[PDB]
Design a binder for this molecule. Structure first.
Ligand code: HEM
Length: 280
């Protein structure tokens, strides 16, 4: 039992975009780090109805890279609008204790909104990875637009997990006008703009209770004109893709790094990469 383990997470509201050439950058492996656990969350349209038939390239390309580095894919789950994959180094796995489990929650009769939770145990400590997706317009169990449901929160369990991560587009936005938002961004006043971000409002309403976001130092990750760094001001610049963390059991989770990946420009949203060190 190591005293500590590292986790990398990435999410991207990637829409219809395809596997990039440079997956090492996407996963935070380009400076030679070797995280114990990797989670990849996507939001978009048509993943199960793989009409472009891009599923096979995703599997080939991710598998080729990660197996060579000593990872086992614990689970990939795809719905029409979400994807969640969790990888763990083979060396940490004990089949008799792993207890690998995934649930899918859907909130609407078309199965477009909800979330996915994948959980597993290593060294007798339980990890859970959540992603979620909600539309602006739906009726919800919270009567808010935010992509929260108690069923996706394993910290609310009678026996809550040791290490929990929630990654994706939480449907949290910057509640001010585009002019004022752009001005803040031009001044690099990230904390000033974050003052208008809705995560705190969701928490006042008792959603994402006790979940922590690492400090944000990067500019809003949406909405860009593709293949530029120029905001499309038809939307107020916002932080779409987020990483939250919690422990149910008093374990220390230390963010090492939290950043958008500005080199992935192909789309309106920029992926977000988080790195953590967890103490068992
Ligand atoms: C950059 C965008 C995307 C990322 C980062 C991504 C990520 C992933 C990952 C990590 C896997 C599992 C790979 C493995 O087996 O180790 C996967 C599988 C898959 N993805 Fe994606 N995905 C993307 C876009 C898409 C798109 C656009 C489609 C369809 C339109 C799609 C459909 C699939 C399918 C069908 C699978 C296979 C699931 C199975 O084997 O049953 N994904 N994706």
């Amino acid at each position: 039992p190591p005293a500590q383990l590292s986790v990398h997470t990435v999410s991207w509201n990637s829409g219809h975009e395809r596997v990039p050439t440079n997956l090492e950058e996407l996963l935070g492996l380009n400076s030679g780090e070797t995280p114990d656990v990797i989670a990849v969350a996507v939001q978009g349209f048509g993943f199960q109805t793989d009409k472009p038939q891009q599923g096979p390239a995703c599997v080939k390309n991710f598998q080729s890279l990660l197996t060579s580095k000593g990872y086992t894919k614990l689970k990939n789950t795809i719905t029409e609008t979400m994807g969640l994959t969790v990888y763990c180094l083979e060396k940490h796995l004990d089949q008799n204790t792993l207890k690998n489990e995934t649930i899918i929650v859907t909130v609407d009769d078309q199965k477009k909104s909800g979330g996915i939770v994948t959980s597993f145990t290593i060294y007798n400590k339980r990890f859970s990875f959540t992603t979620s997706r909600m539309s602006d317009e739906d009726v919800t169990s919270t009567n808010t637009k935010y992509a929260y449901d108690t069923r996706l929160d394993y910290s609310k369990k009678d026996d809550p997990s040791d290490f929990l991560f929630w990654i994706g587009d939480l449907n949290v936005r910057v509640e001010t006008n585009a002019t004022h938002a752009k001005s803040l961004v031009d001044q690099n006043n990230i904390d000033g703009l974050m003052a208008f971000d809705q995560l705190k409002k969701a928490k006042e309403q008792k959603l994402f209770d006790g979940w922590t976001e690492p400090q944000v130092t990067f500019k809003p990750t949406y909405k860009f004109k593709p293949n530029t760094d120029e905001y499309d001001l038809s939307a107020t610049p916002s932080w779409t893709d987020r990483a939250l963390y919690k422990s149910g059991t008093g374990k220390t989770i230390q963010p090492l790094s939290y950043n958008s990946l500005t080199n992935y420009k192909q789309t309106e949203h920029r992926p977000v990469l988080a790195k953590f060190r967890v103490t068992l």
